Symmetry: D2
Amino acid sequence: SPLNPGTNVARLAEQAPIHWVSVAQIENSLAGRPPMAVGFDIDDTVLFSSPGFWRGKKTFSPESEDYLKNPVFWEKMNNGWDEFSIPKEVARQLIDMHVRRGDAIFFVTGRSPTKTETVSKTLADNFHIPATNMNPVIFAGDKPGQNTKSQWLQDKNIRIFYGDSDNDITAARDVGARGIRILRASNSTYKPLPQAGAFGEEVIVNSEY
Amino acid sequence: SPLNPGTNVARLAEQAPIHWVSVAQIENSLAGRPPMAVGFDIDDTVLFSSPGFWRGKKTFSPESEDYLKNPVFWEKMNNGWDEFSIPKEVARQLIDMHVRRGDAIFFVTGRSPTKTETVSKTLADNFHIPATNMNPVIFAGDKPGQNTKSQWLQDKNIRIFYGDSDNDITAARDVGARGIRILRASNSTYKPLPQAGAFGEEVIVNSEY
Amino acid sequence: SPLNPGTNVARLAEQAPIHWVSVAQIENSLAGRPPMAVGFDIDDTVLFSSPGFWRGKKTFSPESEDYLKNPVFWEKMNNGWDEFSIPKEVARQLIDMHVRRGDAIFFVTGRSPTKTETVSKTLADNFHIPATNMNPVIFAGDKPGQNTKSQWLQDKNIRIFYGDSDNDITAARDVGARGIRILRASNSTYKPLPQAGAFGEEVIVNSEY
Amino acid sequence: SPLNPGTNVARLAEQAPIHWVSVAQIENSLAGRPPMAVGFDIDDTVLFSSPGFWRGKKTFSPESEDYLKNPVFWEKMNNGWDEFSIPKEVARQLIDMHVRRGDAIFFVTGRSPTKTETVSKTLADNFHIPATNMNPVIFAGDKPGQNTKSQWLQDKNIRIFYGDSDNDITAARDVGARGIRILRASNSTYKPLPQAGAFGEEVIVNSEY
Ligand SMILES: [Br-]
Ligand SMILES: [Br-]
Ligand SMILES: [Br-]
Ligand SMILES: [Br-]
Ligand SMILES: [Br-]
Ligand SMILES: [Br-]
Ligand SMILES: [Br-]
Ligand SMILES: [Br-]
Ligand SMILES: [Br-]
Ligand SMILES: [Br-]
Ligand SMILES: [Br-]
Ligand SMILES: [Br-]
Ligand SMILES: [Br-]
Ligand SMILES: [Br-]
Ligand SMILES: [Br-]
Ligand SMILES: [Br-]
Ligand SMILES: [Br-]
Ligand SMILES: [Br-]
Ligand SMILES: [Br-]
Ligand SMILES: [Br-]
Ligand SMILES: [Br-]
Ligand SMILES: [Br-]
Ligand SMILES: [Br-]
Ligand SMILES: [Br-]
Ligand SMILES: [Br-]
Ligand SMILES: [Br-]
Ligand SMILES: [Br-]
Ligand SMILES: [Br-]
Ligand SMILES: [Br-]
Ligand SMILES: [Br-]
Ligand SMILES: [Mg+2]
Ligand SMILES: [Mg+2]
Ligand SMILES: [Mg+2]
Ligand SMILES: [Mg+2]
């Protein structure tokens, strides 16, 4: 790659054809809809939880991705390491908005389940979610005695699902929910970054922080 | 304004909430729709015609907007000065696409009408539009003996209207047609630049050239 | 290319490594330097002259670059077609700044020379350049009876050369003058766009209009 | 603020006049310079340490900035909470480059000093810094028995100082070192973001991650 690559104004102005939306446009699109159920992926959607995953990786499997199948990792990740996870502003805004509408708030995660979890609590506390709006984190997947994320969406009648990963958007699509994309921060340790907008879905502006 | 204003990454990554689309996405949204009528504003939508407007302003009214109510200007502008107008690439793609589909193509302009006009021919020539798809330019407005752009869109059953200006999109909105925005180039002499996406309409990416 | 390519925040925030400068920064870098000679390339540096080039190409050689070796083209281009050329705002700022400082202003072009030329006058008129600061356009090249752009910069003791093309900056580099890049507009008909900053030179921000 | 603010291509292409540089351009600028001393701010320069500061703040002073004057906070921040701090790629690249040159690597921080600190170790381990290149973190400030960051730069003959905050760049400027800016991540909890480039200094591209 050249030492001085230069640029040109076609590249400076170039836009990908993304359907960008704001929080205000989403609220507007819902105006006069009665209280409903909506859901959020957790990691890189409402929490920059990379610190915990990064400590996990270094502590348990510095040379592979095996820490993610290790129950001792998950016990720590789910029971306190979220105290170093940084709440996303986009999620504060969306959650306050959905609380303002009287909506029911669900969090649906692909994290491995553990005996106990204080994530539900970290989320109710960090985002000021009233007990009445709040629901215990749902641990979805394809282990025996789990339902998948789409089954949970169908089961909870979740109408809007917010998330950063392709599987978040497809899961919403599968059950006819509205999948709305959030940008993953470029300093996340989960890489490569997804291509936000890859299914033609709404992507929220400035949602990396 | 500071000599060294500096910047930051929230500002470098910031996106306005615009519904961007590509030509390809628009062609796909129309897949299996039979032939229909579509229309295009001219100036800064399919032709960068500032050269003639600029020449006009300097020649007839260096000091005002008066040239635009001068019939001697309009006669030069519509009978040759578009030989200096530069066709937009976005318009070559859109028009080739609509030709492919077998659509009827209309140009609806706010330019003042004149005895004769060679703009229709400049457009059929520059854009390789088959006579069968092509239609003479419609000069629309609020002069006696004119109909408005909206009435013309209703009259021709134009389903899609492309334009750079707010009135292009609202004229489409008036009659229930799909208004699609094209970016006016920053070197156009028509200023200020419109706020593309001001009505929540689709805006075509990279459509300034 | 995918219908929905999507994007990500590493790509939204990505910057090429360019030395951007403002007109204000350049004026400040010259603070308390006495009057000097500076020069400007014409086409896409101070005038968006694509209208005349475009008209030329269609009229004389729809199918080649031959129009550019046609004396009948050059006679039209240099004796009036610049009435359709659109002055760049960056050039109004730079030239007003250099006039302020009392600098001698040169235009050095690669256009083919002709019997007469009204480009010098178009530039003195459009840019309000005082006759005392102004100099007739220098037509430079490798034709017999010509000197090259570099020799002209050496000959006039031009300390700063502004231009959009690689040869503008390298001609400056050849003779030890400060080469400063201006962005060619994306609707110019001269393609491909140069890679501004390809030599580690300064590039003026927003200089496409 | 409007629900549909729109945009225009002047804004889409608009650039701040920053002197952006790459890691390769910096190495190139140093080529054939003998081994030297160079230094790095820590927080948001080589480590996204916001997780630790964010846990600190919530644990010790949820309603003020007093945690930053609390020694119990600093003992935890400096003795393990960096295990959740995320190394910046830009810092891996710069440190490997400066290690390749045989340079001496210093880290100079404004963190309050504590009895012990394992930050030096976290940094040597995460960035693979050979013992011979590595130096214990220097805790600078204006407490009694400290030297300021500029005094330390002068004292260690540090020739290049990398950092995200204005005080990093001014400290380098004060002693005639080369201050090079790194972009603070927009998900940092330390806000507002600095204006990278505010002294006309080099800013490294894409240095938020
Ligand atoms: Br391992
Ligand atoms: Br493991
Ligand atoms: Br813990
Ligand atoms: Br917020
Ligand atoms: Br479970
Ligand atoms: Br699942
Ligand atoms: Br993904
Ligand atoms: Br990536
Ligand atoms: Br589509
Ligand atoms: Br006048
Ligand atoms: Br007039
Ligand atoms: Br094209
Ligand atoms: Br009308
Ligand atoms: Br408008
Ligand atoms: Br404007
Ligand atoms: Br300056
Ligand atoms: Br030909
Ligand atoms: Br020819
Ligand atoms: Br101006
Ligand atoms: Br030459
Ligand atoms: Br070039
Ligand atoms: Br190009
Ligand atoms: Br407190
Ligand atoms: Br405290
Ligand atoms: Br610890
Ligand atoms: Br790296
Ligand atoms: Br100390
Ligand atoms: Br200090
Ligand atoms: Br700062
Ligand atoms: Br900020
Ligand atoms: Mg996620
Ligand atoms: Mg128009
Ligand atoms: Mg040029
Ligand atoms: Mg810092």
